[PDB]
Design a binder for this molecule. Structure first.
Ligand code: Z84
Ligand code: BOG
Length: 334
């Protein structure tokens, strides 16, 4: 019942993998190998976790990443094809390998800093939003959505993932270290991605943190009264009160020649006040996605318990809990 493993040697480490996985070729530092899975006939990424139980911190991340990927089962969210260890018992458990689909590209490798047709933009943003609907219904905020976190195959089929400038896609409240993120920080990132796919150009290419916030304010305006009332920081309150009011720009004069439904969607994504931004569920119902939208095929997740990973446990306890997740893993049907 236990598969037969082979001990090869890549990127200065003894990988030990099941025989089904062949032609292991390294692709970037855990360290990840590309492989061919003879059991399914798929090209796969095998990730050897790095020093998973070296420290409490490593042990927690290992367990958090494994737990969450096991939970994630949606076409537009990365998921697990397999999880394995060479260990036969908990007492020798020291390495964790994760296996997923090999996509071949991220969104930059697809975009090449070029304009996409309006139709292609629809299909790509629809899939991001559909994947965010699922994630957000699990009560998870991504927080670092950007093109390098989006895997795309040749047919432009898209998966959201998290590899663990980047700041270009970050919501203003995150740049400013507010400590109460709503899920629409991810919608902010979607809006920045969409703009750039439509225009060929980064929407906010800040040279640095302050510049990034100057660029944002230029597009969306300085905070109104309703937003200013929501600021608890006195020093933040004061500084904003001291700014020269700037009007919000008219997006049609920024996205010249785009579909006006794309323009209208961008106006609903890139609202300074995060409470006033469109949600993922809402955005999928927007007429921009009329050709792709299907209310009966836009699934939600069972809610996910994040308190399990926020515990303060001993190394051996995280390890024994990670071991259990390895053992209970059930692959998907193919
Ligand atoms: C500590 C922690 C916990 C959770 C997460 N999250 N949260 C998320 C979502 C569920 C999106 C919120 C996803 C992840 N994690 C995640 O994506 N991990 C990855 N594993 C690989 C292995 C294969 O790489 C190459 C490859 C992949 C695909 N196509 C070609 C090449 C890639 S990305 C991150 C860190
Ligand atoms: C440069 C100053 C303007 C930036 C204002 C950020 C607007 C985000 O808006 C704010 O999102 C916060 C979540 O962190 C919530 O606490 C607030 O309810 C919401 O209004």
């Amino acid at each position: 019942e236990r598969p037969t493993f082979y001990r090869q040697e890549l990127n200065k480490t003894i990988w030990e993998v099941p025989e089904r996985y062949q032609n292991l070729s390294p692709v970037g530092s855990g360290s990840v190998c590309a492989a061919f899975d003879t059991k399914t006939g798929l090209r796969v990424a095998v990730k050897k976790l790095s020093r998973p139980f070296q420290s409490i911190i490593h042990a927690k991340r290992t367990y958090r990443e494994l737990r969450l990927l096991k939970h994630m089962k949606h076409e537009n969210v990365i998921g697990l094809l397999d999880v394995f260890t060479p260990a036969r018992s908990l007492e020798e458990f020291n390495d964790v390998y994760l296996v997923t689909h090999l996509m071949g590209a991220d969104l930059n490798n697809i975009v090449k800093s070029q304009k996409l047709t309006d139709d292609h933009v629809q299909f790509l943003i629809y899939q991001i939003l559909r994947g965010l609907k699922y994630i957000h219904s699990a009560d998870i905020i991504h927080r670092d959505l950007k093109p390098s976190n989006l895997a795309v195959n040749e047919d432009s089929e898209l998966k959201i993932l998290d590899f663990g400038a980047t700041r270009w896609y970050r919501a203003p409240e995150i740049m400013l270290n507010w400590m109460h993120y709503n899920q629409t920080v991810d919608i902010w990132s979607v809006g920045c991605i969409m703009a750039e796919l439509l225009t060929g150009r980064t929407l906010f290419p800040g040279t640095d943190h302050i510049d990034q916030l100057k660029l944002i304010l230029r597009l969306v305006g300085t905070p109104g009264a309703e937003l200013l009332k929501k600021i608890s920081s006195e020093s933040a309150r004061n500084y904003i009160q001291s700014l020269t009011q700037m009007p919000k720009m008219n997006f049609a004069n920024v996205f010249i020649g785009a579909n006006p439904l794309a323009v209208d969607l961008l106006e609903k994504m890139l609202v300074l006040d995060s409470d006033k931004r469109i949600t993922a569920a809402q955005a999928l119902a927007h007429a921009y996605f009329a050709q792709y939208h299907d209310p009966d095929d836009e699934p939600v997740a069972d809610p996910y318990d994040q308190s399990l990973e926020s515990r303060d446990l001993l190394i051996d306890e995280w390890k024994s809990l990670t071991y259990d997740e390895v053992i209970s893993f059930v692959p998907p049907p193919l």
